[PDB]
Amino acid sequence: MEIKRFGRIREVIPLPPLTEIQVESYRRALQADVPPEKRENVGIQAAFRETFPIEEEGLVLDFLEYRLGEPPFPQDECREKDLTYQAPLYARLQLIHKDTGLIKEDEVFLGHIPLMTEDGSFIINGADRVIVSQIHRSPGVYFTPDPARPGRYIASIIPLPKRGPWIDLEVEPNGVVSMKVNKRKFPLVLLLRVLGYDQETLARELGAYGELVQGLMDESVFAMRPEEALIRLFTLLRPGDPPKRDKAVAYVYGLIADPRRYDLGEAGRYKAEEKLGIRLSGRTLARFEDGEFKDEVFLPTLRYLFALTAGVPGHEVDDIDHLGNRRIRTVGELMTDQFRVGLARLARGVRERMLMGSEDSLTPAKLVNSRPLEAAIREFFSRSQLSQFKDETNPLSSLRHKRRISALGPGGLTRERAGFDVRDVHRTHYGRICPVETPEGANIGLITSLAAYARVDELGFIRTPYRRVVGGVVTDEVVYMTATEEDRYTIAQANTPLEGNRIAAERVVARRKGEPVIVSPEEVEFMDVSPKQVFSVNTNLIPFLEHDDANRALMGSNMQTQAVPLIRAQAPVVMTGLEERVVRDSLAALYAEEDGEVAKVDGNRIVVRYEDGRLVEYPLRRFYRSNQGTALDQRPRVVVGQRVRKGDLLADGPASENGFLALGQNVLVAIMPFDGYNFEDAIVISEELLKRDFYTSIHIERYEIEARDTKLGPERITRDIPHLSEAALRDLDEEGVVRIGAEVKPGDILVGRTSFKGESEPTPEERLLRSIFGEKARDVKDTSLRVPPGEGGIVVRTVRLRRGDPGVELKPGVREVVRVYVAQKRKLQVGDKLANRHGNKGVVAKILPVEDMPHLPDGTPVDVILNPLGVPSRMNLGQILETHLGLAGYFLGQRYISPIFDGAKEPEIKELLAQAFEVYFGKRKGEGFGVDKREVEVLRRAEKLGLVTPGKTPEEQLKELFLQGKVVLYDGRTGEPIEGPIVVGQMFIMKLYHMVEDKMHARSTGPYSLITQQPLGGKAQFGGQRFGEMEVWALEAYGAAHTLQEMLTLKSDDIEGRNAAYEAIIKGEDVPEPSVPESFRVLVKELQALALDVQTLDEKDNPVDIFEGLASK
Amino acid sequence: MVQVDGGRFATSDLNDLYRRLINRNNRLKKLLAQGAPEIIIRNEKRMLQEAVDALLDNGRRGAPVTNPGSDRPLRSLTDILSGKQGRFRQNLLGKRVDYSGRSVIVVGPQLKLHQCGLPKRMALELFKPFLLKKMEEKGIAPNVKAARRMLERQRDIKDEVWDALEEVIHGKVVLLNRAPTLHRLGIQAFQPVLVEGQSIQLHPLVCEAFNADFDGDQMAVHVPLSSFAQAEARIQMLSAHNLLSPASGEPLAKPSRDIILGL
């Protein structure tokens, strides 16, 4: 099956590594392989140099270097034993006595640091996890207008999150400028006096703008000493606090001048220098040296504010949603932030431990307590919002999860308090953030995806590539630039016609600061690399995207994450061209490292003899259970003795076919109504799909049980369960566990366990019952693990962990834990969900035998019937064009690649259909068959509808219908043709994760809540359904008084009523009258706890007791 | 303060709030007996007043009291009774109920207006108390207790149980519900028909009132129990009896989509 390619745009560069946002950022933070003497001042190295040295203020603790050891256990062991994949961390410290001058050095153990796997994920407590990047406002200096009063601007200074307070500079109506710290407003002139400023300096610098300087020339504070002004300022900032200089200088310095408390950041310092046109020595607002405060940024900030009010051309306001003012915090930065917090707590403990206890004899090991550091690190990787359970339904699911960008999390926005401005598509998202891929609902516009060609720079800004244009000819030089730099150029579109490397069109469509314009070729400076850089990876996999509505394209890209791997999965007939790269970059398949010859091929291993002579053996992952329950396996694709080049495929991973992404099946589709079984997005399928094992998936479920120690006695895992027959114990081995390979159904026992019953008084009735039968009671009861209702399958694995095993860290009192794995093969059934890449989705409502399906005149039946009523309202025409190209490839036996926005067109599709007709109809003529009688009748109506040209031969008219994608279709039930030609073709359809077998649930009676005594909720808890407020309103409007009273009392919380109702039904009687619900009794008691007297009365106002005298003294 | 399936204990936040008040009340008694100065006594009295406030309404005045090792405020008596998660709106105006189920819905074109499709497995659990009596009446089981033990294991269920289930539901109706329930037409009564499968079958003509389609929607099932409840559902809530809109009086069950296209 050959592949035909469409398109005209020649891409100069390939796609970058798709996981480099995760992998590269964590490498920079750890710096594990660079020698210590050559390490840069980034990552955890910068954290060490910030907290250290620690001075008592004569004991000094100094930092020299650090190192990371080998992980104690491999990745596979951590998953099985519920461990964390991590590496030990050691620090080399020295202690210096300022008095004596003696130095002692030793290496202290600081703890463990979780390690990132090769694919870019973490293993935390045996579970795979992904750290999601965060987007937030960049630090710097910004200028926005005042909304309350026109003509006024406000200057803001923003530090890094949790690294200092915000500073606001505003001109008051009286003309005096104010500075606001920690919700307290105070005059900026007072602060400037502390910074050693004179009126002559202020007048010289800021006196050439207007009347604004008049408000900065007070004279009561000016003549005051800066130290006297410092103590006055401290009184305002800290009301009530006694005014001591040691308490005052330690507060002003720590507010704006302390590098350990205030940090502008590398991004914030760079932005401030670019905007204000200055050079900052550090990352603080002011520097404190020689017992005096020196200004760094306040004066340039105030100069810009005064000039902006005047109206000088070089000053402008700032757009906070501009992507040049927003940055990305990656996993490396997020972990380092928590690392610094834990390191700060360690220094606090060291300082207090060196001022008490064995002052003369101290060592760095004794002073250092690393527990606060380990606690902060483990909290980030476990209980953080940005640390998320990994999504690995298919290989594409995990690739998307690592490229997602979130505005939520600590220091971010709130889902309920987010406005419309933050959720909108900005003009600067072009080429950096995908405009369509987002979740509809309360998270819309807050969680997004990175574009295909985009990449995050060192400062955290997203950049996109462009091609340099000089003199009207396009070059091969590619420049990556940020949004702020992009606004200075005219950038043309990638679809501009070119004759070689020179622009041929006289009129060029381009962008200027985001707006579309028409320019001459001589005015073009840059060009787009490809249309693919505008969208993300998921959106780039949708062919004919330009014919689909944006709302429906959102569903198509999102639902590809939920597709399940299939045992006979195949690549789509029509592709876009990214299928091969997705599989390669997911690290799910296996490729040859270099040229060589395959020596051994097996279902479990592959051995390759490389040219240099070394032997490498690759173990294959077989029947492994993912986080979502889908089965992940690797199938070898080579034979013994086969020669392989570098990069050749060795084994296919899940949802892949010969190295191509394969999320579904290719099926024959007819677009027509069918007897109301296509009603409202329903789908009709053929039984022939089940016969060839199409849409069949494998799933694995895990069950767990524990044996503990109790005061009454120890729980035992055993085969000798009391009062059990031999039939129920047939499949258990001698140890009490189910044997491997046994089929289990609901109610079957997986592992047997006994418990000590304890002390109790046998009812008098049971006393007589046991005396008549002469049966002595036992001291143990049945507490075994059984299959939940609606489940079951085949036992494939049993895992047993015991106390004292190497690497097994059980909780106290736990003796052993047993895990059982059950696997099932799921075929397609009624209620399962199907979808295609264009957003069309539905559930299977009918399965028909082969003789009932519509068939072609040659006898070939269709597989799927789709309702045409779903197309016109959704405006997703891409599925129609895909069906047309699928029909041509069905008879020509070829596949196609059509890139988005540059690919196959109708003139090219119709010429392929002309060749497919010559084999669809030319074969019939050779066999000795003409035109069917039924085909003649349909052609007679076809010209009445204006579909074919009158006067032509029947063969010519049939070719006209074929070029429109329509064929004559026969009814399988009657044998008569459909009265009109029907669109028939080949389409790619995926099977989704949502299945009816995992959602059906029912309950008659079950567990109840502790306080309210109402039924629990959830299928896993065997709970009941919630009858909410709006459901109660519906019964009231119907007038069904007795039906409503049943649900409120007899079926929820009337304990006496629910016991009596059950006993009445099993005796063939009618249910009794309901009583007072238990929830009302709880409300009365809770109101009494608030010292409120609530009493129920009667017609004569006499008190009525609703507690049956159980609470009356 | 209850033990759980394991060995650890679980307790409510009210116990901590009661402990704080007792500890400070007892310390004030000892301080008064020792003749402490007024400065020490006044601090204790101020702390006692604040402890009473936290028990009654935490966070109303001052910083809320939080448990050590966390920043989560403790739930007080006022928080229990007020809000969307309070006692009124969560436990008194709405409840979870028994004899209820949920599953995915598909279209049934062969059903009558007053019929729906109920899976057999769901119906076995929904009508379990009625089925146990029926099996005892026939020779399937000797008593109700033995009848219940047969249904516990799937492989122990004979073919005669399904025949008895048909007799149990003869003439009865169930309630179908789809969220959100914007109007009273979001709950309707149908006469169930037992079907093979795991999905509920819905009549095409009632989809508009439910605002339900077939791209993944689920529904809930409820069983009225008494004769009064059955009579109200069969007379006032039957789908075939509610054909006009209560808001405007125009027809609400009417041809739509393929039905209009064909005619």
Binding site: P239, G240, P242 | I39, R42, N43, R46, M47, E50, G62
Partner: peptide
């Protein structure tokens, strides 16, 4: 003011 019980106590003992 008076929102911090700790600050209130420190002021009293300082007299």
């Amino acid at each position: 003011s008076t929102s911090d019980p700790v600050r209130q106590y420190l002021h009293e003992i300082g007299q």
